[PDB]
Amino acid sequence: AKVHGSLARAGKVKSQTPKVEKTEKPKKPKGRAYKRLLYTRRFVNVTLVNGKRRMNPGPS
């Protein structure tokens, strides 16, 4: 099938997507400490039980 299409538009969407810079945020602990934070998150303090559980909910 056709081989010589149009290359005029390559890189279109990325180049026309509004640049939002990264947001400067709290330092996240590198190492055993991240696993610590993870444990106390998942299996110590418990956020919710909306039916079951949600590891990453938004608005609800």
């Binding site: 099938a1 056709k2 081989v3 010589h4 149009s6 290359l7 538009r9 890189g11 990325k14």
Partner: protein, 144 residues
């Protein structure tokens, strides 16, 4: 006992037969005939470099409807020609013709990947630098 000779001295016939029917195993055949070397744009190697002839815009198969940016490439080691897709958004912006690129397989043993017909390869590096670092911003395409 269905065909196969069960006797105590019929080793010969059994392994012979085993060879015979080994030949119906596609990758046994191909590994034994030498196809990896004989055919195949790469020489059986994992990767191959080569120069860029022209820039192609390959309309994808059905039921998809787009244009897949590629290049025609002549492999240095063995002069064979082959067309390679240029991954990610843009990146056909990174090449230019007569450029010296680095091709790898598409992870299907031959077999074109998605909706891209007859493209069994891809671009990994150009001009000495990695296409990825270019697409991000880590690095910049060398002189010429």
């Amino acid at each position: 006992g269905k065909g196969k000779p069960r006797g105590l001295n019929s080793a010969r016939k059994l392994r012979v037969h085993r060879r015979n029917n080994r030949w119906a195993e596609n990758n046994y055949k191909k590994r034994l005939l030498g196809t990896a070397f004989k055919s195949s744009p790469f020489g059986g190697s994992s990767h191959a470099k080569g120069i860029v002839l022209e820039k192609l815009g390959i309309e994808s198969k059905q039921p998809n409807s787009a244009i897949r940016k590629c290049v025609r490439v002549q492999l240095i080691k063995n002069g064979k020609k082959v067309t390679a897709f240029v991954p990610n958004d843009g990146c056909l912006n990174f090449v230019d013709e007569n450029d010296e690129v680095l091709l790898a397989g598409f992870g299907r043993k031959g077999k074109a990947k998605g909706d891209i017909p007859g493209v069994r390869f891809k671009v990994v590096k150009v001009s000495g630098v990695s296409l990825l670092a270019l697409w991000k911003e880590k690095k910049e395409k060398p002189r010429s």
